[PDB]
Ligand SMILES: Cc1cc2nc3c(=O)[nH]c(=O)nc-3n(C[C@H](O)[C@H](O)[C@H](O)COP(=O)(O)OP(=O)(O)OC[C@H]3O[C@@H](n4cnc5c(N)ncnc54)[C@H](O)[C@@H]3O)c2cc1C
């Protein structure tokens with residue numbers, strides 16, 4: 201009895217907690233189990249963005265058929281069409297469900313373009329959605345167990361912002377000053393709270409998402425067991441195995457839990473399991489290069505494959521160029537700052553090989569593609585001058601105008617030299633190649649055309665360029681000492697492949713037969729996006745949308 205529920209959800213990422221709230225609202229008894237001491241997983245440390253074509257809040261026109269054209273073009277037949285149809289059907293319904301039934305609120309990023317402007321059915325903004333700032337005081341004592349935002353996602357490492365509120369500051373648009381004042385203002389004047397916590401009471405981005413979903417579970421009294429890792433599946437049947445529960449380790453020993461209706465695997469990927477990386481991912485591969493929290497070690501993937509579940513796309517990760525920070529367990533991803541004018545990426549021959557403004561997935565893939573030719577692109581090198589340094593952030597580096605060079609970071613987070621030849625030698629890059637790449641950059645910046653990789657050639661690239669810089673907001677000269685290098689690792693925000701599912705998130709065996717009772721969502725599952733990333737929110741949109749469809753399918757089963 202007391203270890204029996206209709207639905208057991210493994211993991212407390214956004215997909216898992218959404219599925220839990222939805223299953224509850226459809227009249228099912230739910231338990232959530234979380235491996236770690238914190239709820240929210242990678243979701244909590246993310247931008248919290250979801251990619252929702254044809255959402256109700258768009259300021260421009262969109263349609264199911266345009267969104268399907270775009271997804272068919274982006275996924276290149278790797279994904280069952282009925283899963284693409286199901287995503288486009290349910291993604292808007294999942295966000296309307298959040299907005300009508302939770303304190304958490306999503307709204308569109310109106311100016312945030314889809315990542316593939318060259319594909320048919322692309323939109324110039326509005327499909328990407330993000331959370332309103334969320335009031336952590338509504339969590340009471342459960343605030344203590346939230347996986348906390350990386351301090352880089354906060355203003356002066358203190359004040360929570362939305363991507364909308366932020367973007368103004370990174371692009372250097374007019375009014376950014378009042379925003380800084382409004383944000384840090386709110387924080388310091390938050391007095392009853394300032395006295396019990398140095399954390400902003402207001403959470404943004406993935407922290408708003410994870411706080412808001414935790415709050416939804418609290419209102420519904422859905423139990424969430426922390427420090428309670430999944431270990432294995434319970435099955436019945438001689439001929440076709442059905443999943444009837446799980447074994448967890450709870451208060452330090454094994455406990456058998458029964459799921460009458462279904463088990464939802466939302467435990468994330470295997471990015472933190474070096475053996476699984478070496479088994480499946482391209483070499484060289486290193487878990488240390490990941491931007492994720494510590495735990496996604498493929499625990500549910502192994503257990504499901506043990507009972508006949510099929511896996512796909514296991515050779516793909518959600519790549520991001522990433523930066524080692526001393527003392528920090530995760531590397532910092534470079535999501536936006538590469539689009540800024542005056543920085544170039546080179547291999548060990550000092551040659552460019554990628555549009556520096558490339559979406560991060562394609563950037564990672566291009567590092568592996570050039571590494572196979574050159575032998576020196578994983579890691580690769582980011583180069584910029586003292587004007588870039590003064591003006592712009594770059595992962596853990598804040599603009600030099602507000603933060604001077606840290607001695608403890610020299611040769612660890614950045615290399616610095618009075619000359620380009622001097623810098624090249626410190627980082628093992630061909631000086632003549634790097635000089636050639638800088639000379640070409642300076643020519644490109646003059647007439648605003650990158651003749652090799654077309655940096656700034658579309659509205660996605662220019663979104664994170666500098667508004668003030670013309671003709672191309674992504675291109676500026678490199679010529680004012682000192683010169684800086686940063687080591688760009690082939691990082692990730694999770695693995696992309698996983699258990700094969702159908703349109704209702706049911707796990708499929710090697711014969712495409714559903715494993716009765718077993719669902720799988722998020723990076724635990726093979727990506728509905730194939731080898732692509734359609735726009736900001738292309739991992740969390742799918743996690744939450746298939747979580748919604750899983751709960752719906754379980755309830756519709758009676
Ligand atoms: C800085 C950053 C920004 C990002 N921004 C975005 C963005 O805005 N939008 C977007 O779409 N993607 C974004 N991503 C990627 C995104 O965060 C992930 O792809 C997504 O969170 C994966 O969700 P998930 O639910 O599969 O896993 P997670 O969110 O990581 O949740 C999995 C949970 O399962 C738990 N777990 C693991 N093993 C077990 C076990 N054995 N038993 C029980 N629990 C277990 C984990 O501890 C964890 O809490 C970002 C990533 C980072 C690092």
Ligand SMILES: C[C@]12C=CC(=O)C=C1CC[C@@H]1[C@@H]2CC[C@]2(C)C(=O)CC[C@@H]12
Nearest residue numbers: 247249353363366535536735736737738
């Ligand atoms: C690019 C990104 C990541 C993956 C994804 O798919 C969706 C987003 C959108 C929000 C940004 C986030 C990364 C972190 C950013 C740059 C911030 O610190 C402020 C806005 C965030």
Ligand code: NA
Nearest residue numbers: 238346347348
């Ligand atoms: Na934390």
